[PDB]
Design a protein around this ligand. Structure first.
Ligand code: ZN
Lengths: 48, 49, 188, 159, 286, 278, 191, 70, 53
């Protein structure tokens, strides 16, 4: 689990603070809807 | 792209001319050795390395 | 043009080499192209130029040098006389290593073309130039000195052959074999 | 090939030797290793220079180690009970840089001096086991010491 | 420039592997490859290198071909693997340097501003080191030799690597002070006595041989100048070196004595340790 | 159709290139393609290794560049002889030698491409000439699991394979893979040149000038002898001690060999004094 | 798409500086190379063209390539001054064609001679007999100036193509100014 | 072989060592120590080191891979 | 370089965080959100002048 803080135009490049680790610039997963992912929303990121 | 960065740390003391005890800023401490012309005179303890 | 260069070499043989600028014991003097052209220039003057560098005092050649070229030589005769005295001091050490390198004060007096009593004063002046670092003993004014720089080696480097080098090296390997014979089992 | 060579061991028939050479020249080491052992058995005790030359030459040119290992046993088998006839070959195999050829040389010491307490065979074996870094060659030397001392086995445990 | 030429061990092996790769054809008689290294300082260190296809012909040594595409494409791909890696010179086998080398050198000079030639020998011999370092420059000789363009020898060294001799040295090795002065003295006498004599012998032969085929016995100032530097010691007769008497001879006795007096004390410790070891410990009938 | 304890022969050049490339990319786990030779099932020898340019994707199959492989192969064809790549060689810094699901996905693609598909895992843990942290692994098929994974026709080779055994981390992910033995490929002149360049070059072998010697030696000889004078008191204690019950007496202070070697080698300088020179 | 690779030999010399052919002999030589590269490209895209000066230095200006862009760049800033050394260049060109990995492509050499060559006629004839054994077609277009009648080259071409051989045309420089198109027509008409 | 093995014992010490503090000796040839990380480990003491130095907690160099009291 | 840059930003170890300071031999010191400080001999792909402490 991690918490989103922002979103960007074109490739969203949502940047997420894990909870103590780092600000991670993670792209959305292939099998997800971009609209469903939202700024200021808790999200789950696969480490691998 | 080839360069891989260097841990920033402070020399706690000079164990020997070959090896100086240093502490990484994050906290784990490793005894370390100087590289080439590292000017050990300017590597006196209390210098960031 | 051989003749034009021989004419340039006539000047090189005369004022050009008479000038204190060139005196290298044949580094330039024994170079073949200029010396053959300088053969047209008086041979005795050309010989006198070699004589100052390696013949040192060459008192007979000193009389000859005035004959070889009155211009330049007369103007710098005192300075050149000093240079040959320095050349004589360098000559003993490089030409003779040990043994003959050590020589009497009187020979240095002849080498500096000065009186033997005067040479006690004169050797010090020649030693003073200190062109080459060495060890000098005034018991007989013998040289037996350390570092010296020869402009070129004499003859065909006969000292470099079995006269000094090479022959000694052959002796060493036989002694190296003696070390092997002394301790073959240890070599394993 | 392994069965035919064992069945024809000591016959020294030219036809079996030629067929074993055909398997040797097949260039397949697993079949070739069987052929190499068979080649040694058929010519065991032969002291045949031509056979030893063919095997040593093939071993030098054979890239596969498995063929070399089978050939190595074969070279020892051909030189059987020489006692001094194959000493030059034994020196050459020990001299050979390849470890498997050196192992064959230790085996050649054993076969040439089988049931012999000859000091010369023991001495060469003694130096190689200490000198050779390769463990397989060192192991081969110890095995060879047993074969030579079967005739006098009282001293066999002490070494 | 090119003050020293350290060559990494991996490159030293790479030349030998190429010789085996072209071992099928012995006609070339040499192995030629682009030498890639980093000019971190005046010291030049060779790193990973690749071999450009090249043919050397005995016909006037003018039939020489270097593939521009192979040199450019491989160097670019290798540079992609290492940013530090850059063309620093070229390497060839054939220990006697061919006359064609200078022409190949001019192409090498174009590719790298201060390139160097390393004459590594795939078949190693004895003495010194395998790589030979030569840099070709154009200048006016002070004495006056025409053209004065020739390769100049430069110091060469072996590079540092980790876990490299596990493949090779693990079988042997002799890292101890046990063999110091037991065989080490023998090697120096073996080469300084013979190899040092051989180079001097080449010059002594050159007194007539240099006249016959050499550039000149009286040539290359260092022939006499370096030899005279080697003759820092006089070389004959009085010498005044080991014949110093009050000087070196007296000192040799003081140090030899101080070194020797320990041995009498040394024997005492070793002998008594043996006496306790055998006279008491062995003698335990129980 | 049956696996065996096959031997992988690593040429010195391939091993040297792998560790050097691995050391450079140890932080980023660099990967490369191994130019091996499939001479026969029992023996596989990697004659050469080449390093893939660093790829952002990782050690994954996608990271490998098809265009780079084709052009590199063409260069190998023009100079010397090219060989079909046996498999992918790569470095995992965190776990000396280990296997991963990501690794198997690339390994499966290489297995589809050829047969042996050997994978090597070199790492930063190292020794000057005694580490060999590198290990080689080949996956075992789930369908093949019902059949014996590796039938052995030779007992001794299985015993040699048994000596490495398994690593505890490797044991955790061992299932679905089988370790394959790796041995150095035969080295002859290659061994000889490094051998010539070891004592003569890697170790100090000037030889012409190989032979401090009389300046600090007097200090070292006095200091070691002083240590012996204090140390010899412990042997003096042992001889005086009744020692009815065995007790440690700090004997074997030794240093006798160290003094003997130093004094004798310096005394051997007499050969330089009157024989090597005049 | 006939597969052929041509190691052309360009000439850079004080003679080439003369502009009797076109505004400049070098520019005309560059134009002649341009048409042959275009002709090879029309015949097959894979066709490789490579060129080098045969004067003073006879290395490889460009390795043979299907793309003609490298050929054009090498022609630019050719810089003319070196005395002609055709014998070394011709030997280099023949072996260079063998050097190419794609020997399947037909091997041909086109050369330009701007100055008389001071070589023994027997020596070039000996090379020409070796070239005949190599069986690589060579056609030479002399540019601006040449040895009178190119007698040594005419014998060299005959030795290269004797016994009902290809008889590749040898073009002696047309006296005075010559149009590049006039020079191009003879090779296009026949090898 | 003895000399080569003795060199190997010296070699483990030379590689960069993480700093550590000795805590307790369970038995000879073993120890419990806290590193700069602080995590307590069942490390093995090197044979050469004098045992008397080990008893005060002091500071003990730890091999990075082994964590042992180098 | 752009493809590597895109992959690295996307990757989990990008650890985007502020630069503690800017240095010259052209150099940067970055404290990652992991709270670990690293000095980079090369300031980076982005322009040194563009980067702000
Ligand atoms: Zn992997």
């Amino acid at each position: 689990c991690t918490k989103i803080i922002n979103a960007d135009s074109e490739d969203p490049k949502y940047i997420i603070n894990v909870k103590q680790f780092a600000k991670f610039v993670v792209d959305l997963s292939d099998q997800v809807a971009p609209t469903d992912i939202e700024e200021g929303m808790r999200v789950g990121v696969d480490r691998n | 792209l080839q360069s891989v960065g260097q841990i920033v740390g402070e020399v706690l003391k000079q164990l020997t001319e070959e090896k100086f005890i240093v502490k990484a800023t994050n906290g784990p401490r490793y005894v370390v050795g100087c590289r080439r012309q590292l000017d050990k005179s300017k590597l006196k303890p209390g210098t960031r390395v | 043009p051989v003749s034009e260069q021989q004419e340039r070499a006539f000047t090189l043989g005369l004022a050009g080499l008479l000038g204190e600028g060139v005196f290298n014991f044949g580094e330039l003097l024994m170079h073949p192209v200029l010396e053959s052209l300088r053969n047209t220039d008086r041979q005795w003057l050309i010989d006198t130029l070699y004589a100052f560098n390696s013949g040192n005092v060459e008192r007979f050649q000193t009389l000859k040098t005035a004959w070889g070229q009155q211009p330049d030589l007369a103007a710098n005769e005192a300075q050149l006389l000093r240079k040959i005295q320095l050349l004589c001091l360098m000559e003993m050490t490089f030409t003779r290593p040990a043994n003959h390198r050590q020589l009497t004060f009187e020979e240095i007096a002849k080498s500096a073309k000065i009186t033997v009593n005067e040479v006690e004063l004169l050797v010090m002046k020649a030693l003073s130039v200190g062109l080459v670092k060495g060890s000098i003993d005034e018991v007989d004014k013998r040289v037996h000195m350390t570092w010296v720089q020869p402009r070129v080696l004499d003859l065909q480097q006969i000292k470099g052959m079995k006269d000094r080098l090479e022959f000694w090296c052959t002796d060493v390997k036989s002694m190296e074999m003696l070390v092997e014979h002394q301790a073959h089992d240890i070599l394993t | 090939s392994l069965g035919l060579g064992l069945a024809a061991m000591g016959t020294a028939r030219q036809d079996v030797y030629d067929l074993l050479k055909t398997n040797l020249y097949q260039d397949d080491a697993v079949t070739g290793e069987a052929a190499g052992l068979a080649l040694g058995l058929v010519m065991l005790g032969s002291k045949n220079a031509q056979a030893i030359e063919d095997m040593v030459g093939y071993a030098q040119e054979t890239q596969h180690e498995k063929i070399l290992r089978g050939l190595a046993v074969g070279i020892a088998l051909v030189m059987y009970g020489r006692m001094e006839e194959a000493d030059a070959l034994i020196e050459s195999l020990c001299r050979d840089k390849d470890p498997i050829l050196r192992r064959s040389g230790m085996y050649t010491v054993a076969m040439a001096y089988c049931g012999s307490g000859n000091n010369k065979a023991i001495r060469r074996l003694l130096h190689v086991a200490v000198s050779d870094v390769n463990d397989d060659v060192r192991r081969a030397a110890v095995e060879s010491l047993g074969f030579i001392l079967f005739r006098t086995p009282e001293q066999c445990p002490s070494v | 420039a090119v003050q020293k030429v350290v060559v990494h061990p991996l490159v030293l092996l790479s030349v030998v592997d190429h010789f085996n790769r072209i071992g099928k054809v012995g006609n070339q008689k040499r192995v030629v490859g682009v030498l890639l290294g980093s000019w971190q300082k005046k010291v030049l260190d060779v790193s990973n290198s690749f071999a450009v296809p090249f043919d050397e012909d005995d016909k006037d040594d003018s039939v020489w071909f270097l593939d521009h595409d192979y040199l450019e494409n491989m160097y670019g791909m290798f540079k992609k693997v290492n940013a530090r890696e850059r063309i620093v010179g070229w390497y060839h086998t054939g220990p006697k340097l061919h006359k064609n080398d200078i022409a190949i050198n001019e192409l090498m000079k174009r590719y790298c501003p201060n390139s160097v030639l390393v004459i590594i020998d795939v078949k190693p011999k004895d003495l010194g080191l395998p790589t030979e370092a030569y840099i070709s420059v154009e200048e006016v000789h002070d004495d006056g030799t025409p053209t004065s363009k020739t390769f100049e020898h430069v110091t060469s060294e072996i590079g540092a690597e980790e876990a490299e001799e596990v493949g090779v040295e693990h079988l042997l090795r002799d890292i101890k002070d046990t063999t110091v002065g037991t065989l080490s003295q023998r090697i120096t006498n073996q080469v300084h006595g013979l190899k040092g004599l051989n180079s001097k012998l080449l010059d002594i032969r050159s007194y007539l041989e240099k006249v016959a085929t050499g550039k000149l016995p009286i040539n290359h100032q260092i022939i006499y100048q370096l030899q005279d530097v080697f003759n820092l010691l006089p070389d004959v007769s009085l010498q005044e070196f080991v014949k110093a008497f009050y000087l070196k001879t007296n000192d040799q006795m003081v140090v030899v004595y101080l070194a020797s007096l320990i041995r009498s004390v040394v024997a005492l410790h070793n002998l008594i340790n043996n006496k306790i070891a055998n006279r008491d410990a062995e003698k335990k009938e129980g | 159709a049956v696996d065996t304890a096959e031997q992988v022969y690593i040429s010195s050049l391939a091993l040297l290139k792998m560790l050097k490339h691995g050391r450079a990319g140890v932080p980023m786990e660099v990967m490369g393609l191994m130019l091996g030779e499939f001479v026969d099932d029992y023996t596989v020898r990697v004659i050469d290794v080449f390093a893939m340019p660093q790829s952002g994707t990782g050690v994954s199959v996608e990271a490998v560049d098809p265009v780079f492989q084709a052009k590199m192969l063409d260069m190998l064809k023009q100079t010397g002889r090219p060989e079909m790549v046996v498999g992918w060689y790569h470095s995992h810094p965190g776990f000396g030698c280990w296997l991963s699901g990501v690794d198997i996905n690339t390994q499966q693609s290489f297995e589809a491409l050829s047969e042996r598909a050997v994978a090597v895992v070199v790492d930063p843990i190292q020794s000057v000439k005694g580490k060999v942290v590198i290990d080689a692994f080949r996956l075992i098929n789930a369908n093949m699991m019902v059949l014996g994974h590796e039938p052995r026709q030779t007992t001794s080779n299985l015993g040699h394979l048994n000596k490495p055994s398994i690593q505890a981390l490797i044991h955790g992910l061992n299932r679905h893979y089988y370790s394959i033995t790796i041995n150095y490929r035969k080295n002859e002149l290659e061994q000889k040149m490094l051998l010539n360049l070891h004592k003569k070059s890697w170790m100090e072998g000037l030889t012409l000038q190989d032979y401090v010697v009389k300046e600090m030696l007097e200090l070292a000889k006095n200091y070691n002898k002083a240590v012996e004078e204090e140390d010899k008191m412990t042997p003096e204690q042992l001889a005086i001690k009744n020692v009815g019950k065995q007790d440690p007496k700090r004997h074997l202070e030794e240093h006798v060999d160290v003094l003997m070697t130093s004094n004798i080698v310096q005394c051997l300088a007499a050969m330089l004094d009157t024989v090597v020179f005049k | 798409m006939v597969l052929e690779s041509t190691m052309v030999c360009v000439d850079n010399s004080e003679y080439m500086r003369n502009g009797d052919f076109l505004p400049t002999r070098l520019q005309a030589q560059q134009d002649a190379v341009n048409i042959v590269c275009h002709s090879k490209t029309r015949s097959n895209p894979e066709n490789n063209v490579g060129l080098i000066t045969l004067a003073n230095d006879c290395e490889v200006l460009t390795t043979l390539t299907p793309d003609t862009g490298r050929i054009l760049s090498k022609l630019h800033t050719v810089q003319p001054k070196g005395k002609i050394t055709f014998c070394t260049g011709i030997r280099v060109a023949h072996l260079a064609l063998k050097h190419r990995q794609g020997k399947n492509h037909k091997m041909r050499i086109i050369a330009f001679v701007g100055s008389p060559v001071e070589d023994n006629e027997k020596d070039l004839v000996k090379l020409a007999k070796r070239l005949k054994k190599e069986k690589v077609n060579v056609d030479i277009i002399n540019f601006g100036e040449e040895e009178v009648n190119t007698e040594k080259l005419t014998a060299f071409v005959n030795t290269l193509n004797g016994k009902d051989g290809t008889g590749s045309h040898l073009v002696t420089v047309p006296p005075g100014p010559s149009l590049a198109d006039a020079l191009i027509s003879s090779p296009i008409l026949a090898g | 072989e003895f000399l080569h093995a003795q060199e190997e014992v010296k070699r483990i010490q030379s590689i960069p060592l993480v700093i550590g503090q000795f805590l307790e000796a369970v038995d000879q040839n073993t120890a419990i120590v806290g590193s700069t990380t602080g995590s307590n480990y069942y490390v093995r003491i090197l044979s050469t080191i004098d045992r008397e130095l080990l008893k005060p907690n002091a500071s003990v160099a730890l091999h990075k891979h082994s964590n042992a009291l180098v | 370089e752009n493809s590597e840059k895109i992959k690295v930003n996307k990757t989990l170890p990008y650890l985007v965080s502020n630069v503690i300071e800017l240095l010259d031999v052209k150099c940067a010191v970055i404290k990652t959100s992991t709270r670990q400080t690293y000095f980079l001999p090369v300031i980076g792909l982005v322009d040194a002048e563009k980067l702000k402490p």
